[PDB]
Every structure is written in structure tokens, then in C-alpha cells.
Amino acid sequence: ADVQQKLAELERQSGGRLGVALINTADNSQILYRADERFPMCSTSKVMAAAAVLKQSETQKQLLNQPVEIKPADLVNYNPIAEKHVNGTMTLAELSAAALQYSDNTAMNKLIAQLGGPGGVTAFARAIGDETFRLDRTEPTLNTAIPGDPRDTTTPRAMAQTLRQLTLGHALGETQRAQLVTWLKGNTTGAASIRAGLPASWVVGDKTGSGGYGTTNDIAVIWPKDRAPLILVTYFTQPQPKAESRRDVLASAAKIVTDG
Amino acid sequence: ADVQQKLAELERQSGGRLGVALINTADNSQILYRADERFPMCSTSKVMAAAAVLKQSETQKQLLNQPVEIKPADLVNYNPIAEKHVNGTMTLAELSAAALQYSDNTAMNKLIAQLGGPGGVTAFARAIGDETFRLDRTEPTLNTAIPGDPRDTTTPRAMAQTLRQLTLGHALGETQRAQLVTWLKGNTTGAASIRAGLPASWVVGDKTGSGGYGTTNDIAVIWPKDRAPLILVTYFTQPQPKAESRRDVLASAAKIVTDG
Numbered sequence: 001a002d003v004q005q006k007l008a009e010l011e012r013q014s015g016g017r018l019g020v021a022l023i024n025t026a027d028n029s030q031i032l033y034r035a036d037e038r039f040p041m042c043s044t045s046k047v048m049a050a051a052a053v054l055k056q057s058e059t060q061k062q063l064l065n066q067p068v069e070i071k072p073a074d075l076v077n078y079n080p081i082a083e084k085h086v087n088g089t090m091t092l093a094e095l096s097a098a099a100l101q102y103s104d105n106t107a108m109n110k111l112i113a114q115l116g117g118p119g120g121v122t123a124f125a126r127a128i129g130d131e132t133f134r135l136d137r138t139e140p141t142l143n144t145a146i147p148g149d150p151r152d153t154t155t156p157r158a159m160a161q162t163l164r165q166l167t168l169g170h171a172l173g174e175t176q177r178a179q180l181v182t183w184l185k186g187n188t189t190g191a192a193s194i195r196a197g198l199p200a201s202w203v204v205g206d207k208t209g210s211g212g213y214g215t216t217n218d219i220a221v222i223w224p225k226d227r228a229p230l231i232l233v234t235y236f237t238q239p240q241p242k243a244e245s246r247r248d249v250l251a252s253a254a255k256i257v258t259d260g
Numbered sequence: 261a262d263v264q265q266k267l268a269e270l271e272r273q274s275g276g277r278l279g280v281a282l283i284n285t286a287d288n289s290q291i292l293y294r295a296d297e298r299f300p301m302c303s304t305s306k307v308m309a310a311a312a313v314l315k316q317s318e319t320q321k322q323l324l325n326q327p328v329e330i331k332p333a334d335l336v337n338y339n340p341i342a343e344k345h346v347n348g349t350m351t352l353a354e355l356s357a358a359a360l361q362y363s364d365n366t367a368m369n370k371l372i373a374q375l376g377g378p379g380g381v382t383a384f385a386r387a388i389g390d391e392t393f394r395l396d397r398t399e400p401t402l403n404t405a406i407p408g409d410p411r412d413t414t415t416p417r418a419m420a421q422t423l424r425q426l427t428l429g430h431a432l433g434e435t436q437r438a439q440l441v442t443w444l445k446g447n448t449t450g451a452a453s454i455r456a457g458l459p460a461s462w463v464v465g466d467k468t469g470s471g472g473y474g475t476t477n478d479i480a481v482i483w484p485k486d487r488a489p490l491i492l493v494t495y496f497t498q499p500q501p502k503a504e505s506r507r508d509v510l511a512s513a514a515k516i517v518t519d520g
């Protein structure tokens with residue numbers, strides 16, 4: 001009501017396109033803004049890949065311990081963890097943490113390969129009831145975020161529903177659900193995004209994303225002071241290929257939908 | 261300099277008092293702004309406490325695995341990790357990680373108690389040649405940040421020199437230095453502060469703080485794309501007791517001093 005008006009006011013001054021999906025698990029209420037429009041996921045896609053590899057680890061005992069070779073030719077555009085291990089190895093646990101907490105694009109490419117390509121991540125999405133998610137490309141081209149391109153996109157509504165099932169639902173075994181939530185809570189990249197819009201007392205696990213067209217994304221599980229968890233997806237994209245990131249817009253969207 | 265004009269402009273437009281110390285380890289060059297003025301450290305003091313415990317673990321080789329009791333009465337104002345272990349235990353390693361990466365105030369009180377009180381943190385600072393740093397109080401009163409109050413203060417220059425010795429120098433043993441850097445690089449709270457002012461490709465370990473009078477702090481070790489490491493300290497405080505935190509001022513400061 002006032003929230004829809006305020007989200008429209010924010011978008012109108014933002015210089016881009018804003019998508020919001022909030023799920024309040026206290027009462028299963030939702031706040032949706034362009035929640036059925038497709039947005040480029042960029043690195044928010046890493047949550048689906050890490051979750052798919054967690055699911056694999058329910059049946060392959062010690063999968064997370066399995067060392068994976070990192071070669072110089074594996075490195076892509078953003079490799080803060082992987083570069084230390086070129087001509088060496090990282091475990092699937094280390095690749096999962098590097099992708100989620102550091103947004104390591106080489107780490108994500110090893111998760112994708114472990115799942116049999118982009119289509120294997122999409123198949124996992126389908127298996128947990130997400131019919132909207134699609135991963136089409138590897139890193140780093142999955143972040144081109146070209147307006148109108150359906151590659152590597154989802155909708156705020158579908159991503160909010162998926163994150164709820166992965167982090168609070170029974171899409172994963174209990175140990176795997178706890179590991180995902182532990183990784184998301186240890187994110188290093190999120191303080192300027194959704195978190196920036198919330199009271200300092202609230203606990204957040206999130207995964208950010210960014211790419212071309214100034215695309216600026218965050219998906220978060222939020223444990224508010226004295227309240228049941230929230231799921232929040234904030235996606236934002238701009239019309240110019242070289243636009244700057246707008247994490248402030250995401251913070252503003254989070255303040256609007258949580259202001260009560 | 262251009263840099264001096266930019267920092268003076270940032271400070272004046274912020275309404276506050278800004279303290280900046282950059283060390284460039286390529287050539288030991290410095291950028292300095294009010295770098296010898298005292299500022300309330302707030303949670304940036306956690307680095308000295310965690311480093312003091314690391315130093316103790318060089319002679320007490322099992323210390324980081326020691327279980328510490330968390331009682332309900334131990335909980336202070338911000339306990340994101342410790343509240344999960346009330347009526348249980350956490351190891352000194354888990355408490356160091358909680359303090360550094362989550363700014364857990366109950367975890368910091370455990371580190372202070374391990375060192376025999378705020379005096380024990382100050383004694384470690386003096387053992388590594390920091391004659392400026394003082395810790396006077398426990399959490400959460402060490403964050404009051406009252407203008408003119410010398411308690412729980414240091415200077416940007418002294419904290420930058422100290423962070424250099426701890427993370428890049430020989431204040432700690434090689435293992436302990438590596439562990440401190442690993443903890444700082446895994447900080448969850450920093451993406452809106454120094455990091456937000458830097459090129460995305462630069463790797464950062466940092467410790468934020470905030471307290472009374474809108475005090476907003478960050479201390480960081482920076483491995484730039486293709487350059488020798490930097491140490492940067494950005495301290496900020498405001499005249500009004502319940503002023504808003506301003507992490508954007510620290511990001512602006514970081515951009516100004518690194519743009520060259």
C-alpha cells in the first residue's frame with residue numbers, strides 16, 4: 001500500500017529497474033514488486049550451485065572433502081581464493097565457501113562442472129520445484145546481464161520461494177541446510193546491500209551479485225530481533241552497459257519493505 | 261595535496277572529525293589526515309585482543325582449542341554467535357573468529373578476560389611497540405565514544421603501524437600472523453566501509469567498529485591488483501550523541517587516498 005508506492009518512488013529515482021520479493025515466515029505474507037519479471041541473477045546463482053553440491057553430498061559420503069585441481073587456464077575475471085591454489089587443489093567445501101562468501105568466479109565454475117554444466121544447476125532447480133530459474137552459461141559470461149536476455153535469469157518471486165525451501169525448508173537434509181545457512185551467514189560481500197537497510201541487531205545470511213548494465217542484486221535470509229525469519233530478494237538493473245553498482249538502492253528497498 | 265583538499269572537503273561535508281592513515285608497503289609512503297589525533301576505537305580494538313590471544317597461543321600451544329563457558333549473564337548488547345552457545349562452551353579460536361568477523365561483544369569480553377582485563381590488551385600493545393593504544397573498559401562501555409574521553413582510544417598512525425606489524429610484519433609468529441589475516445579476510449561486516457571505496461579486484465581483510473556519537477571506523481590490510489599491500493585506517497566520529505553511522509564516509513576516504 002504505502003510500501004508499493006514507496007518502492008515505485010525508489011525505482012523512479014534509481015535510474016533502473018527494481019524487483020523485490022519479501023516472504024515473512026511469521027504469517028507467510030509477501031511484498032512483491034515486479035516479482036514475476038525476469039532479472040539477471042549474476043552471482044546470486046551461486047546459491048543454487050552450492051545447494052546442488054550440498055544435495056550431492058547427502059549420497060556421496062565425504063564429497064565436500066574431494067580435492068579439485070585448479071589450473072592457470074581455469075582462472076577467470078575474479079578469483080580471490082582460487083588464484084592462491086593454481087597448479088594445486090581446493091576441496092568442494094572450499095570451492096563452495098569461496099563461491100558463496102567471496103563470490104569467487106573460478107570456484108563457481110568448478111561447482112558448475114561438478115553438476116555437469118549449467119544445465120545440471122537448472123535440473124537441481126527443477127528437482128526442488130523452481131520452474132523459473134535457468135542457468136545457461138559458465139563464469140564469467142553468466143554476468144553479462146544484457147537487458148531482454150533470458151539467459152541466467154530468474155524472477156524475485158521464484159528466487160524468494162527457492163531460498164526459503166533451501167535455508168528454512170526441507171529441500172536439503174538437515175546437516176546440508178545448516179551448512180548453507182552457516183556459509184550465507186559468513187558472507188563477506190553483503191554489508192552495503194540488504195543488510196545496510198536493516199537494524200544492526202538483525203542477523204543476515206545473503207549472497208550478492210553484480211554484472212553488466214550496473215546489475216546489483218542480493219538475496220537474504222534475515223533473522224530479525226524477536227521475530228520469525230524473512231526471505232528477501234532485491235534485484236536491480238540499469239539501461240547503460242557500463243552503469244555503476246547501486247547497492248544503496250538495495251539497502252533502501254530492504255528498509256522500505258521491513259519498516260512495518 | 262589534491263588528497264588533503266578532498267579529505268578536508270569530505271570531513272566538512274560529513275559534519276564530523278575524520279582520521280586517516282595509509283601505509284603503502286611498496287615504498288613505506290604514507291597519507292595522513294589528523295593521523296596523530298585520538299579516536300574511540302570501538303570494535304577496531306578487537307584486533308588487538310585477538311592478536312594478544314594469538315601471541316599467548318605461541319607459548320600455550322593448545323590455547324586456541326580451550327573451551328570457555330558462555331553463561332546467560334555473559335550476554336551483552338550484540339551477541340550474534342555467543343547467544344547460540346549460552347549454557348555451553350566456545351573455544352578461544354571460535355571466540356576470536358566471532359569477535360573479528362561478526363563483531364560479537366560477548367566474544368570480545370571472553371578475549372579480554374583471557375588476557376586478565378583491558379590492561380592485558382594494553383600490555384600486549386606495549387610488548388609490540390604500540391605506546392598509543394589504550395583499552396580501559398569491557399564491552400559494551402568501551403564504545404561510548406564521548407568527545408574528549410581518552411579511554412579506549414588510539415590514533416590512526418599508531419593503529420596503521422600496529423596493523424602492519426600484526427598482518428605483514430613479525431609482531432606474531434608466521435602461523436599466528438596467517439591465522440589473523442585469514443580471520444580478517446573473512447570479516448562479514450566490512451563491504452560498506454573501506455572495501456566500498458576500492459576497485460572490486462583488490463583483496464581486503466578488515467575490522468569495522470561503531471559506537472556513540474555516530475563513531476564509524478574501519479581498519480584494513482589491502483592486497484591491491486598487482487601492487488604491494490596497503491594498510492589503511494579510517495576513523496570517524498560526530499558531535500551529536502545519537503548521530504547515524506556513516507560507513508559511506510570511510511568508503512569515500514578510501515577512494516580518495518587510493519585513486520593514485
Ligand SMILES: *C(=O)/C=C/NCC(=O)CCO
Binds near residue numbers: 043044078143460
Ligand atoms: C557475481 O555477481 C560476481 C562475482 N565476482 C565478479 C566480481 O567482480 C565481484 C565484484 O563485483
Ligand SMILES: *C(=O)/C=C\NCC(=O)CCO
Binds near residue numbers: 468
Ligand atoms: C563495534 O564497534 C562495537 C560493537 N560491535 C558490535 C555492535 O554492537 C555493532 C556491530 O559491530
